[PDB]
Amino acid sequence: SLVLDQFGRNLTAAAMEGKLDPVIGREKEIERVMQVLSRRTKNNPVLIGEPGVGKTAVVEGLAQAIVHGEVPETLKDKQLYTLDLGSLVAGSRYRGDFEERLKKVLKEINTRGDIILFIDELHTLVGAGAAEGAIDAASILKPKLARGELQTIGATTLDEYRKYIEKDAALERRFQPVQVGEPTVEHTIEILKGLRDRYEAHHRVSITDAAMVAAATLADRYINDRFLPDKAIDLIDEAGARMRIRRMVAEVDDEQIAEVLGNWTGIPVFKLTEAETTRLLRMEEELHKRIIGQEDAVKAVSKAIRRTRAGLKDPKRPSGSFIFAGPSGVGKTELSKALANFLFGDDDALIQIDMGEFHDRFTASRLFGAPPGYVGYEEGGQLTEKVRRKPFSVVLFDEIEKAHQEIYNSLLQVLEDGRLTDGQGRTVDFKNTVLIFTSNLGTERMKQKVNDELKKHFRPEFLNRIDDIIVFHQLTREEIIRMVDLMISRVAGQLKSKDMALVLTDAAKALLAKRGFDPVLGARPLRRTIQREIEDQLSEKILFEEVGPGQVVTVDVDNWDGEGPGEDAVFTFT
Amino acid sequence: WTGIPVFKLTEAETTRLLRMEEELHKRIIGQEDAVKAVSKAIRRTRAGLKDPKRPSGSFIFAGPSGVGKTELSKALANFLFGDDDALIQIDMGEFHDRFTASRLFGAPPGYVGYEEGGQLTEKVRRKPFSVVLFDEIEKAHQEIYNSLLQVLEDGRLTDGQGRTVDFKNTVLIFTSNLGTDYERMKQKVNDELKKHFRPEFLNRIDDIIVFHQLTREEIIRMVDLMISRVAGQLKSKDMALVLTDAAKALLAKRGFDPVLGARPLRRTIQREIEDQLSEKILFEEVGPGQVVTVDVDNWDGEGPGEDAVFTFT
Amino acid sequence: SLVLDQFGRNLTAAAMEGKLDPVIGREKEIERVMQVLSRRTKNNPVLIGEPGVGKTAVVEGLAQAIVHGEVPETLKDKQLYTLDLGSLVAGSRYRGDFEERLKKVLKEINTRGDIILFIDELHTLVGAGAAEGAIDAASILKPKLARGELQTIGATTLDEYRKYIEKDAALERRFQPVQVGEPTVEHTIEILKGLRDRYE
Ligand SMILES: Nc1ncnc2c1ncn2[C@@H]1O[C@H](COP(=O)(O)OP(=O)(O)O)[C@@H](O)[C@H]1O
Ligand SMILES: Nc1ncnc2c1ncn2[C@@H]1O[C@H](COP(=O)(O)OP(=O)(O)O)[C@@H](O)[C@H]1O
């Protein structure tokens, strides 16, 4: 007892005082472990599982089963000791110290005979006192473990089992695997219901059953870098901590779990208040604050985001996938910029990928990285990593028709299931991101021309996965008048920072409108008209210090009937 | 230990294995040939009467888009393991480049990522009994099939690290989209597969299955199948939806097109029911504790219904 | 304290003399850190932030909050020590010296219980001294982090996180990411107004 205690911790006395958490739902794996230790030769199981499933929890539950007495006679009255390799290695300046300590431990185990050894993180045994080919813990344990005279229990994750143990086939032979599979949703709910009491006592808060059901569902659905039941426990524990901080008896509901998840991952799953609800209902006007015209596209996107925010989106598919195909300059990109501004408050959050560069057969690997064995393997994908930074995003694929079919064959993955496997092998989540595909093709009859061009330039499946195909309409006179108003407002807002005030009469706005209309319009022209007839004149006029700072500038027009072409009209800057 | 299901067939398991054709028909409407072939393969595998060298099953699936080729594999995984996420899904859409194939089995020694190993081989070693799905196999280059060439016949793959993995107990499924009256389509699909793939690869596969186009009965049952998802989603918010049969008829009328598969129907449902119900929910017109009876007015049930709308109660 | 002063620096004692710059406008991140540090199991936050944003600034603000006493009861009068891994593995020359120093540090922390660790460049835990016969500090720390018996705070670049901690999922599990994003323009102006007195 005195020898093992300085080099290990006894889980039996830990479960005597209840210091270990109760373990429930693990009868199959614990029975598997108990039946492996009841063998004659090679009675050593190692718990292989994905990290965060309960590999140490299985051993704690077995210790509780031992101390209660549900074990058979082969595991009855057995003190389960974990072994700390760090305590063995530390303090050993010399060969004799470490090997003497390990063999004294083994002699005490074989003398008392009722200590089952536990090696958490079993991959540490390949090299303890020296390298893999010298005298260490593994080469001392191997003759003992081969005959089964030393009962030990291991725990190693999947990847480290592949890496460290499997390169040492001698230890791989002597350990019989016990797979601890990831628990289900109902299993996680049961586990949380079991662990209610400890967290309730610790955080001085009370937790409801609906809170735990919501925690399990949200943790399984959204968080895709951790594994059940750890993420559900994380959400519950963090909500309890939030209540403990905020009160300094509180209640935890699913709303607080949603808040914790929103803090953790940024996914906008919240209980909607009145102000954001009226914002969501009236957001078509909010988008129409910036974009002018094109009611169909804003309507479709409003429908998609309203469906997403109300919990009515198919969870295996993204929030929405759109093809914005229409004549150049209409505002296909500006709709995406307006979406970014609405959803995040800033426009730099729009992950914009340009398909102009992806015209070669070698550049498809930029999105999802390079395969193993090639240059760029560690960096991985550019798009996948950008998505992993923030799971809720608007992904913009600008100028689709430039890129050729290999990228779309890559993107059928995300268009169907919202998954993408980068070069490093990891799968990333796209179940919440909004996909926008902007195209410049086909330039009521324009609708059919664009549809025919897209059917000719695409395979049927890629057009089929897309939620809504939206064809942008050409602009009219009222829309370009409002565009002129918006551009002048932008100029005035930029000029506010230089101690200025700017204003235009409606005659100047009309004159700008009459010189900015043709079927090849958009905002690429009629903004060049602004830069040529307003901005340039203002710059040259303020460079030689007339109507400088503190002076309101009024842009007027003379020699114009207000209806004519206005080619002889000139802008006057008072 | 290994998870490979060799046991004594209990009566419940036996009567399930006799009746698993309609169990597959629970999630797939129509496509009797593919369900037939999958049932034959699973019956051969679980009876203990199987070729030791060849894999459990090797199928190539062909048909139009959205005829349930991936849905069949997902429902087969749901049958065997209980959930879709146990399906080992490798989509060949990322493997267009010839240099990309090293991700499948792994990096050779002396190169970066050698210690990481492959992706397909390691996931097969994790679960030796698995349904391996290869989506859109034509979109990968032809040199990628060369790695699968020997697992399709001998069921063994040699990774970069040198280990030999066992593909003997897995069900290999290929899904294609080539070819896009039934016999003419089958002949065209077979000819396209023959001229697209080398004949030494087509001979090593078990059955070539062509998916039949969806008919009116199939899509009108599939209306129910895909609205059950919305009903279950609504059940999480303490409110229920029941469709009038007129709503089902109108949804099946506006979502049917022989040119494509099932996703036009999902578009029709999503635009007619999901979006409008989202507006009604966020307006708080309807909430928890109520029922929603969706009905079609201004319609006769036979006409095309270019003016019919949906009423929500 | 006799062993930690040889290997670490006391930020609470540093905040006693006000040698740390005032931290302005980072109340949300400090609240998130105190939220994570208040948990029962896995109470280790990592400040996942781009370089140049103030990852260490968040920790010094937390130390100033602790010394000013506005923290909740679960962080009241707890000395926040930064852990200098270079000094821990500085004089070893052997196989058992570094692990002995780590055991002494952890035993002093356990017998005190009011000391929170801070690890600049948290990715240095993996491979924190790995000779032919040595066990790195990550494998020592992992059982204590999983049970929640040790409160550690980490600061790590996004890219460094992805290169190093992402490769080790066992240690990645024990740390909750805390997104520290770039301050906006107005936030930068507020920070400059805070730092006016010191720079003047
Ligand atoms: N059946 C269960 N009952 C109670 N708690 C559980 C159960 N399964 C898992 N847990 C919790 O999840 C955690 C699992 O940790 P574990 O997976 O052993 O870590 P590692 O993967 O590093 O070995 C434990 O802290 C435990 O509290
Ligand atoms: N209706 C509009 N409202 C506001 N800005 C617009 C509008 N239409 C165009 N713009 C501006 O003009 C640009 C046109 O972009 P876009 O239509 O995407 O060009 P293209 O169609 O050639 O890709 C946008 O970046 C936007 O700033």
Ligand SMILES: Nc1ncnc2c1ncn2[C@@H]1O[C@H](COP(=O)(O)OP(=O)(O)O)[C@@H](O)[C@H]1O
């Ligand atoms: N017969 C069917 N029964 C139910 N759903 C179907 C059926 N056919 C297609 N689907 C729908 O189509 C999608 C799968 O289509 P898929 O088989 O992947 O087509 P492809 O393989 O050509 O891409 C699923 O989301 C499913 O909802």
Ligand SMILES: Nc1ncnc2c1ncn2[C@@H]1O[C@H](COP(=O)(O)OP(=O)(O)O)[C@@H](O)[C@H]1O
């Ligand atoms: N909110 C803030 N208030 C005051 N100073 C800040 C704030 N945020 C950042 N700083 C300044 O930024 C610097 C911190 O950078 P640091 O986090 O050390 O970068 P890195 O961790 O990459 O070395 C400090 O000098 C600090 O003064």
